[PDB]
Design a protein around this ligand. Structure first.
Ligand SMILES: Cc1ccc2c(c1)nc(/C=C/c1cccc3cccnc13)n2-c1cccc(OCCCN2CCN(C)CC2)c1
Ligand SMILES: [Mg+2]
Ligand SMILES: [Zn+2]
Length: 306
């Protein structure tokens, strides 16, 4: 039973879940209930699944429960504004996939795991944590009384995994660049085809990147505050590198906080802005994401300038 006041306020793209930690796992069911129905999943299964997912978000600074829900929300906003375009399955999974996209995150980029032969880089040669976030996803699903897609036909089943799986791998920011430069061409050549499955996959994947970065798309106090937590997990990875001798990259160096505003500026102009741009080119209604990103770009600009 969520409060009625927010009912309208959560449908906004700039909605921030921060002030409502109490409510985060309700909000999900809320967003699930509004998109796909109340008769989507067996109600009791769906709450089990959710808090188990919650339990399996480490107490990391950034890639933690709050983040899974914020992303989760941003996927909600996009699908509420693109009603017509997404199968009923996709929707379901895309919100599930979003809530689970970062399961059991340690606070460490793939490069950390792969420069230090972590087992995960042994299992997952590439896209290391994502292949793992899907792994964790399956396992919690295969908890008894947690499988919510038991409702489906085995051929609808295997399809909600393959959506879920691709969207989880697509949050691998290293794969984003190809995806979005590839979608830029397909747009510019008139060769985008919503009926083409792989074409849908790329679009889903860009939606997953826009969702995953959506902290850049909030109001400036929300956005600046979330930035504190992004570097607290970055710089932490930096720490473990000096202890191991290698000076970490600038992104991850507590001794270079002062260069952070300009680094934000360059992340926006090379990752954030291209992503919501192609997002708006393909899905026109998603443009308040782009517009909020631009507002925050000005801010980091205005911060660099004094
Ligand atoms: C001092 C300093 C220097 C560079 C900084 C920096 C600070 N902060 C960033 C980016 C903050 C960032 C990174 C990831 C997700 C956010 C979400 C919201 C806000 N910010 C951020 N960057 C930055 C931004 C983009 C790229 C970059 O270096 C080029 C490498 C590109 N990477 C980017 C991501 N990796 C995993 C794969 C490809 C550096
Ligand atoms: Mg992730
Ligand atoms: Zn994420």
């Amino acid at each position: 039973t969520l409060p009625v006041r927010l009912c309208k306020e959560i449908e906004l793209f700039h909605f921030d879940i921060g002030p409502f930690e109490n409510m985060w796992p309700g909000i999900f069911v809320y967003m699930v209930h509004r998109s796909c129905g109340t008769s989507c999943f067996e109600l009791e299964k769906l709450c089990r699944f959710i808090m188990s997912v919650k339990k399996n978000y480490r107490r990391v600074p950034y890639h933690n429960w709050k983040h899974a829900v914020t992303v989760a929300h941003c996927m909600y906003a996009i699908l509420q504004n693109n009603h017509t375009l997404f199968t009923d399955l996709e929707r379901k999974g895309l919100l599930i996939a979003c809530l689970c996209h970062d399961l059991d995150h340690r606070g460490f980029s793939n490069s950390y795991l792969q420069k230090f032969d972590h087992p995960l880089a042994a299992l997952y040669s590439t896209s290391t944590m994502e292949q793992h976030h899907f792994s964790q996803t399956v396992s919690i699903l295969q908890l008894e009384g947690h499988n919510i897609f038991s409702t489906l036909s085995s051929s609808e089943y295997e399809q909600v995994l393959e959506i879920i799986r691709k969207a989880i791998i697509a949050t691998d920011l290293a794969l984003y660049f190809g995806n979005r430069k590839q979608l830029e061409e397909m747009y510019q050549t008139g060769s985008l085809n919503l009926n083409n499955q792989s074409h849908r996959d790329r679009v889903i994947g860009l939606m997953m990147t826009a969702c995953d970065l959506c902290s850049v798309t909030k109001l400036w106090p929300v956005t600046k505050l979330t930035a504190n937590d992004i570097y607290a997990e970055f710089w932490a990875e930096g720490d473990e590198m000096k202890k191991l001798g290698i000076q970490p990259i600038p992104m991850m160096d507590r001794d270079k906080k002062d260069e952070v505003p300009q680094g934000q500026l360059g992340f926006y102009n090379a990752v954030a802005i291209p992503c919501y741009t192609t997002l708006t080119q393909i899905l026109p209604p998603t443009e308040p994401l782009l517009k909020a990103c631009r507002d925050n770009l000005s801010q980091w600009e205005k911060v660099i300038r004094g």
